[PDB]
């Protein structure tokens, strides 16, 4: 057991092993706070996420377990990995705080789209890495659901990792109005059309790729309805087949009220884009999530010829999320989390 030291930062106590030095706040939210630090043991700049009151409720307790379980499983160059997890507690009885540690990235995809003039090759490399990470995430039957620039960490060499800050609740209020929290969402998740699948993340990739290509938000709606209309203007109103898969009868009836529109010509929307980019966008930005290209399929698309290596695009080890449907008390979620803390083995 390491020695822990105590510090206050923005009204939050941080109690961390001495190995972590020069803690500096970088983000806060309902579910936790994040600091940058220097890990004297590895020589790495790290981010440390302290969960806020992890076992205060069943929902917090289960979220705490869920993130730990997930991060412990993620072992891929394009996905956040866990360097360390610790607690100041010496026993289960004492156990009340959880801290998670990863590589500091400090620089997201927003810090790239708005600043740099990105070439087509940059776009290839960035999207390639997203899809390479997504293939891995999706092979574990994990859906990101919230893919957007601020959830993509990018270093100076344009190396990318998928993460999820996951500090915010995603309430109705949070999804309301002219907000980036909604602009990258698949319409079926935005409007709760149906039970959704992992293709939701592909829609988000299309929105991100478009924006890297144009420097502009693809669907910057001023609200849910305005965003839907921007979407349908580009991709066409739904046909018969898709309409019946919209199981929310209310949503179905609204969408049939809309004046039918054809899918636009993407070469006329993305003027001057590599025609292979255009083709990939048309395959990603498909209204019907059954017909969207998957991450594995997209990696093999000619747009990525310069990067694709089918022997270097690994899948995940089997991930058992049977716990997701398990009905447990706070203290049971807590004891499971504790087992996971205690059994963590750091990367080589
Ligand atoms: C694997 C993937 C799907 C991309 C994912 C990644 C994460 N969590 C994080 O990325 N956590 C962290 C985000 C930012 C800084 C951190 C700095 C240090 C450590 C972690 C950190 N989650 C996540 C899962 C579940 C929940 C709660 O249900 C919240 C977040 N999911």
Coordinates of C-alpha atoms and ligand atoms in Angstrom, one line a residue:
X1 CA 0.0 0.0 0.0
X2 CA 1.3 3.4 -1.0
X3 CA 1.3 6.5 1.2
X4 CA -1.6 8.9 0.3
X5 CA -1.6 12.7 0.7
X6 CA -4.4 15.1 1.0
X7 CA -5.1 18.2 -1.0
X8 CA -8.1 20.4 -1.6
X9 CA -8.8 21.6 -5.2
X10 CA -11.9 23.6 -6.1
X11 CA -13.7 22.6 -2.8
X12 CA -13.0 18.9 -3.6
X13 CA -10.7 16.7 -1.4
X14 CA -8.1 14.7 -3.4
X15 CA -6.4 11.9 -1.5
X16 CA -3.9 10.2 -3.8
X17 CA -0.7 8.1 -3.7
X18 CA 2.5 10.3 -3.5
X19 CA 3.5 9.1 -6.9
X20 CA 1.0 11.5 -8.3
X21 CA 2.2 15.1 -8.1
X22 CA 1.2 18.6 -9.3
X23 CA -2.5 17.9 -9.4
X24 CA -4.3 20.5 -11.5
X25 CA -8.1 20.7 -12.0
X26 CA -9.3 20.1 -15.6
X27 CA -13.0 19.4 -15.4
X28 CA -15.9 18.9 -13.1
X29 CA -19.5 17.5 -13.2
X30 CA -22.3 15.9 -11.3
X31 CA -20.7 12.4 -11.6
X32 CA -17.0 13.3 -10.9
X33 CA -14.1 15.6 -11.3
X34 CA -10.8 15.3 -13.3
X35 CA -7.3 16.6 -12.6
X36 CA -4.1 16.5 -14.5
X37 CA -1.0 15.2 -12.7
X38 CA 2.5 13.9 -13.2
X39 CA 3.0 10.3 -12.4
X40 CA 6.6 10.1 -10.9
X41 CA 6.7 6.4 -11.2
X42 CA 6.1 6.1 -15.0
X43 CA 7.1 9.6 -16.0
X44 CA 3.7 10.1 -17.6
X45 CA 1.4 13.0 -17.6
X46 CA -1.9 11.5 -16.4
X47 CA -5.5 12.3 -15.9
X48 CA -7.1 11.2 -12.6
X49 CA -10.9 11.0 -12.3
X50 CA -12.4 11.1 -8.9
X51 CA -16.0 9.8 -8.7
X52 CA -18.4 12.1 -6.8
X53 CA -20.0 10.1 -3.9
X54 CA -19.7 6.8 -5.9
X55 CA -22.0 4.8 -3.5
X56 CA -24.6 7.5 -2.7
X57 CA -27.3 5.8 -4.6
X58 CA -27.9 2.6 -6.6
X59 CA -27.5 4.6 -9.8
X60 CA -24.2 6.0 -8.7
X61 CA -23.0 2.7 -7.3
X62 CA -23.8 0.8 -10.5
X63 CA -22.3 3.6 -12.7
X64 CA -19.1 3.4 -10.6
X65 CA -19.0 -0.4 -11.1
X66 CA -19.8 -0.1 -14.8
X67 CA -17.0 2.4 -15.6
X68 CA -14.4 0.5 -13.6
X69 CA -15.4 -2.8 -15.2
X70 CA -15.3 -1.2 -18.7
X71 CA -12.0 0.7 -18.3
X72 CA -10.4 -2.4 -16.9
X73 CA -11.3 -4.3 -20.0
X74 CA -10.3 -1.7 -22.6
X75 CA -6.9 -2.6 -24.0
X76 CA -6.5 -0.9 -27.4
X77 CA -4.4 2.0 -28.8
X78 CA -7.4 4.0 -29.9
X79 CA -9.5 3.6 -26.7
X80 CA -8.9 5.1 -23.2
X81 CA -7.0 2.5 -21.0
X82 CA -6.7 2.3 -17.2
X83 CA -3.2 3.1 -15.8
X84 CA -4.3 2.7 -12.2
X85 CA -7.2 2.7 -9.9
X86 CA -6.9 3.4 -6.2
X87 CA -8.8 4.2 -3.0
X88 CA -7.5 5.6 0.3
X89 CA -9.7 2.9 2.0
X90 CA -7.9 0.0 3.8
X91 CA -11.0 -2.1 4.0
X92 CA -14.4 -2.7 2.4
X93 CA -16.0 -1.0 5.5
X94 CA -13.8 2.1 4.9
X95 CA -14.4 2.1 1.1
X96 CA -16.1 5.3 0.0
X97 CA -14.0 6.8 -2.9
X98 CA -12.7 5.6 -6.2
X99 CA -10.1 7.2 -8.4
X100 CA -9.3 6.2 -12.0
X101 CA -6.1 7.1 -13.8
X102 CA -5.2 7.3 -17.5
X103 CA -2.8 9.1 -19.9
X104 CA -3.4 12.8 -20.0
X105 CA -4.4 13.9 -23.4
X106 CA -5.3 17.6 -22.9
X107 CA -6.4 18.3 -26.5
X108 CA -9.7 17.0 -28.1
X109 CA -10.9 16.9 -31.6
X110 CA -12.5 20.4 -31.2
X111 CA -9.0 21.7 -30.6
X112 CA -8.2 20.4 -34.1
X113 CA -11.3 21.1 -36.4
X114 CA -11.5 24.8 -35.5
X115 CA -7.7 25.6 -35.5
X116 CA -5.7 23.5 -38.1
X117 CA -6.3 23.4 -41.8
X118 CA -6.8 19.7 -42.0
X119 CA -5.8 17.9 -45.2
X120 CA -7.6 14.9 -46.6
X121 CA -4.8 12.6 -45.3
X122 CA -5.4 13.9 -41.7
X123 CA -9.1 13.2 -42.0
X124 CA -8.3 9.7 -43.3
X125 CA -6.0 9.1 -40.3
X126 CA -8.3 10.5 -37.7
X127 CA -11.5 8.7 -38.9
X128 CA -9.4 5.5 -39.4
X129 CA -8.4 5.6 -35.8
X130 CA -12.0 6.3 -34.6
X131 CA -13.3 3.3 -36.6
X132 CA -10.4 1.1 -35.5
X133 CA -11.3 1.9 -31.9
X134 CA -15.0 1.5 -32.5
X135 CA -14.5 -1.9 -34.1
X136 CA -12.8 -3.0 -30.9
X137 CA -15.5 -1.4 -28.6
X138 CA -18.3 -2.8 -30.7
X139 CA -16.8 -6.3 -30.7
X140 CA -17.3 -6.3 -26.9
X141 CA -21.0 -5.4 -27.5
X142 CA -20.3 -2.0 -26.1
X143 CA -22.2 1.0 -27.6
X144 CA -20.6 4.4 -27.0
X145 CA -23.8 6.4 -27.6
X146 CA -22.2 9.8 -27.1
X147 CA -19.5 10.0 -29.7
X148 CA -18.6 13.7 -30.4
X149 CA -15.4 15.7 -30.7
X150 CA -15.0 16.4 -26.9
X151 CA -15.0 12.6 -26.4
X152 CA -12.0 12.2 -28.8
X153 CA -8.5 12.8 -27.3
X154 CA -5.9 13.7 -29.9
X155 CA -2.1 14.2 -29.4
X156 CA 0.3 16.4 -31.4
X157 CA 1.0 13.5 -33.8
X158 CA -2.8 13.2 -34.6
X159 CA -2.9 9.9 -32.5
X160 CA -6.5 9.5 -31.2
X161 CA -8.3 7.8 -28.4
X162 CA -12.0 7.4 -27.8
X163 CA -13.2 8.1 -24.3
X164 CA -16.2 9.3 -22.5
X165 CA -15.8 12.1 -20.0
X166 CA -19.2 11.0 -18.7
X167 CA -19.4 13.7 -16.0
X168 CA -22.8 14.9 -17.0
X169 CA -26.3 13.4 -16.5
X170 CA -27.6 13.9 -20.1
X171 CA -30.9 15.2 -18.8
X172 CA -33.7 16.6 -21.1
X173 CA -32.4 20.1 -20.3
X174 CA -28.8 19.1 -21.4
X175 CA -30.1 18.0 -24.8
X176 CA -32.2 21.1 -25.3
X177 CA -31.6 23.9 -27.8
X178 CA -28.6 24.8 -29.8
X179 CA -26.1 22.4 -28.2
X180 CA -23.2 20.2 -29.3
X181 CA -24.5 17.5 -26.8
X182 CA -27.1 16.7 -29.3
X183 CA -25.7 17.5 -32.8
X184 CA -23.7 14.2 -33.2
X185 CA -26.6 11.9 -32.1
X186 CA -28.3 9.4 -34.4
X187 CA -31.9 10.4 -35.0
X188 CA -33.2 7.1 -33.5
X189 CA -31.5 7.9 -30.2
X190 CA -32.3 11.7 -30.3
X191 CA -36.0 11.0 -30.8
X192 CA -36.2 7.5 -29.1
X193 CA -37.6 5.9 -32.3
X194 CA -36.8 2.3 -31.5
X195 CA -34.4 0.1 -29.6
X196 CA -31.1 1.2 -31.0
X197 CA -27.9 -0.7 -31.7
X198 CA -24.3 -0.1 -32.2
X199 CA -24.8 1.7 -35.6
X200 CA -25.8 4.8 -33.6
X201 CA -22.0 5.4 -33.2
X202 CA -21.5 5.2 -37.0
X203 CA -23.9 8.1 -37.5
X204 CA -21.9 10.0 -35.0
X205 CA -18.7 9.2 -37.0
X206 CA -20.3 10.5 -40.2
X207 CA -21.2 13.7 -38.4
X208 CA -17.6 14.1 -37.2
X209 CA -16.0 13.2 -40.5
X210 CA -18.3 15.7 -42.3
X211 CA -17.2 18.4 -39.9
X212 CA -13.5 17.6 -40.3
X213 CA -14.0 17.9 -44.0
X214 CA -15.9 21.2 -44.0
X215 CA -14.8 22.8 -40.8
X216 CA -18.5 23.1 -40.0
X217 CA -21.1 21.3 -37.8
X218 CA -23.1 18.9 -40.0
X219 CA -26.4 19.2 -38.2
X220 CA -26.3 22.2 -35.8
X221 CA -30.1 22.1 -35.0
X222 CA -31.5 24.8 -32.7
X223 CA -33.6 22.1 -31.1
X224 CA -34.6 18.4 -31.6
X225 CA -37.1 19.2 -34.4
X226 CA -34.9 21.7 -36.2
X227 CA -32.1 19.1 -36.1
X228 CA -34.4 16.4 -37.5
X229 CA -35.3 18.6 -40.4
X230 CA -31.6 19.3 -41.2
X231 CA -31.0 15.6 -41.1
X232 CA -33.9 14.7 -43.3
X233 CA -33.1 17.5 -45.8
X234 CA -29.7 15.8 -46.4
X235 CA -30.6 12.1 -46.1
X236 CA -34.2 12.1 -47.3
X237 CA -37.4 11.4 -45.3
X238 CA -37.9 7.7 -44.2
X239 CA -39.5 5.3 -46.6
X240 CA -42.1 2.6 -45.7
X241 CA -39.6 0.0 -44.5
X242 CA -38.0 2.4 -42.0
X243 CA -41.3 3.8 -40.8
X244 CA -42.5 0.5 -39.6
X245 CA -39.3 0.0 -37.6
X246 CA -40.1 3.1 -35.7
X247 CA -41.9 1.4 -32.9
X248 CA -42.8 4.6 -31.0
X249 CA -46.2 5.2 -32.6
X250 CA -46.0 8.8 -31.6
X251 CA -42.7 9.5 -33.3
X252 CA -43.9 7.6 -36.4
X253 CA -47.0 9.7 -36.7
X254 CA -45.0 13.0 -36.4
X255 CA -42.5 11.9 -39.0
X256 CA -45.3 11.0 -41.6
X257 CA -46.6 14.5 -41.2
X258 CA -43.5 15.7 -42.9
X259 CA -43.3 16.8 -46.5
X260 CA -41.4 14.0 -48.3
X261 CA -37.9 14.9 -49.4
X262 CA -35.3 13.0 -51.5
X263 CA -31.8 12.2 -50.3
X264 CA -29.5 15.0 -51.6
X265 CA -26.5 14.6 -53.8
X266 CA -23.6 14.4 -51.3
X267 CA -21.0 15.5 -54.0
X268 CA -22.9 18.8 -54.1
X269 CA -23.0 19.1 -50.3
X270 CA -19.3 18.2 -49.8
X271 CA -17.9 20.2 -52.7
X272 CA -14.3 19.3 -53.5
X273 CA -14.1 16.4 -51.0
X274 CA -12.3 13.2 -52.0
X275 CA -15.0 11.2 -53.8
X276 CA -14.1 8.2 -51.6
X277 CA -14.9 10.4 -48.5
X278 CA -18.2 11.3 -50.1
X279 CA -19.0 7.6 -50.7
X280 CA -18.1 6.7 -47.2
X281 CA -20.3 9.5 -45.8
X282 CA -23.2 8.2 -47.8
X283 CA -22.7 4.8 -46.3
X284 CA -22.5 6.1 -42.7
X285 CA -25.3 8.8 -42.9
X286 CA -28.1 6.3 -43.6
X287 CA -31.3 7.0 -41.8
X288 CA -32.1 3.2 -41.3
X289 CA -29.6 2.0 -38.7
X290 CA -30.0 -1.6 -40.1
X291 CA -28.3 -0.4 -43.3
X292 CA -25.5 1.8 -42.0
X293 CA -21.9 0.5 -42.6
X294 CA -20.3 -1.1 -39.5
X295 CA -16.9 -0.1 -38.1
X296 CA -15.4 -3.4 -39.4
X297 CA -16.9 -2.8 -42.9
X298 CA -15.8 0.8 -43.0
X299 CA -12.1 0.0 -42.1
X300 CA -12.0 -2.0 -45.4
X301 CA -13.4 1.0 -47.4
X302 CA -11.0 2.4 -50.1
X303 CA -10.9 5.7 -48.4
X304 CA -8.5 4.1 -45.8
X305 CA -6.3 2.2 -48.2
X306 CA -3.2 3.9 -46.9
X307 CA -3.9 2.9 -43.3
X308 CA -6.0 -0.3 -43.3
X309 CA -4.3 -3.4 -42.0
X310 CA -6.7 -6.3 -41.4
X311 CA -4.0 -8.0 -39.2
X312 CA -3.6 -4.9 -37.0
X313 CA -7.3 -4.0 -36.2
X314 CA -7.9 -6.2 -33.2
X315 CA -11.2 -7.2 -31.5
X316 CA -11.8 -7.2 -27.7
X317 CA -11.7 -10.1 -25.3
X318 CA -15.2 -11.3 -24.4
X319 CA -16.9 -8.7 -22.1
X320 CA -19.5 -10.1 -19.6
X321 CA -22.0 -7.4 -18.9
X322 CA -24.6 -9.7 -17.4
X323 CA -24.4 -7.4 -14.4
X324 CA -26.3 -4.8 -16.4
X325 CA -29.6 -6.6 -15.8
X326 CA -28.7 -7.5 -12.2
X327 CA -30.8 -6.1 -9.4
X328 CA -28.5 -5.3 -6.5
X329 CA -28.4 -3.1 -3.4
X330 CA -25.9 -0.3 -3.0
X331 CA -23.6 -2.3 -0.7
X332 CA -23.5 -5.2 -3.2
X333 CA -22.5 -2.9 -6.1
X334 CA -19.9 -1.4 -3.7
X335 CA -18.4 -4.8 -2.8
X336 CA -18.2 -5.8 -6.4
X337 CA -16.5 -2.5 -7.2
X338 CA -14.1 -3.1 -4.3
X339 CA -13.2 -6.6 -5.7
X340 CA -12.4 -4.9 -9.0
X341 CA -10.2 -2.2 -7.3
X342 CA -8.3 -4.8 -5.3
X343 CA -7.7 -7.1 -8.2
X344 CA -6.5 -4.5 -10.7
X345 CA -3.2 -5.3 -12.3
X346 CA -1.4 -2.3 -13.9
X347 CA -0.1 -2.3 -17.5
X348 CA 3.5 -3.5 -18.0
Ligands
LIG1 C1 -14.9 2.7 -23.2 C2 -15.8 3.9 -23.4 C3 -17.2 3.4 -24.0 C4 -15.1 4.8 -24.5 C5 -15.9 4.6 -22.1 C6 -14.9 5.3 -21.5 C7 -15.4 5.7 -20.3 N1 -14.9 6.4 -19.2 C8 -14.0 7.4 -19.4 O1 -13.5 7.7 -20.5 N2 -13.5 8.0 -18.3 C9 -12.6 9.0 -18.2 C10 -12.9 10.2 -18.9 C11 -12.0 11.3 -18.9 C12 -10.9 11.3 -18.0 C13 -10.6 10.1 -17.3 C14 -9.5 10.1 -16.5 C15 -9.2 9.0 -15.7 C16 -10.0 7.9 -15.8 C17 -11.2 7.9 -16.6 C18 -11.5 9.0 -17.3 N3 -16.7 5.2 -20.2 C19 -17.6 5.3 -19.2 C20 -18.4 4.2 -18.9 C21 -19.4 4.2 -17.9 C22 -19.7 5.4 -17.3 C23 -20.8 5.4 -16.2 O2 -21.9 4.6 -16.6 C24 -18.9 6.6 -17.6 C25 -17.9 6.5 -18.5 N4 -17.0 4.5 -21.3

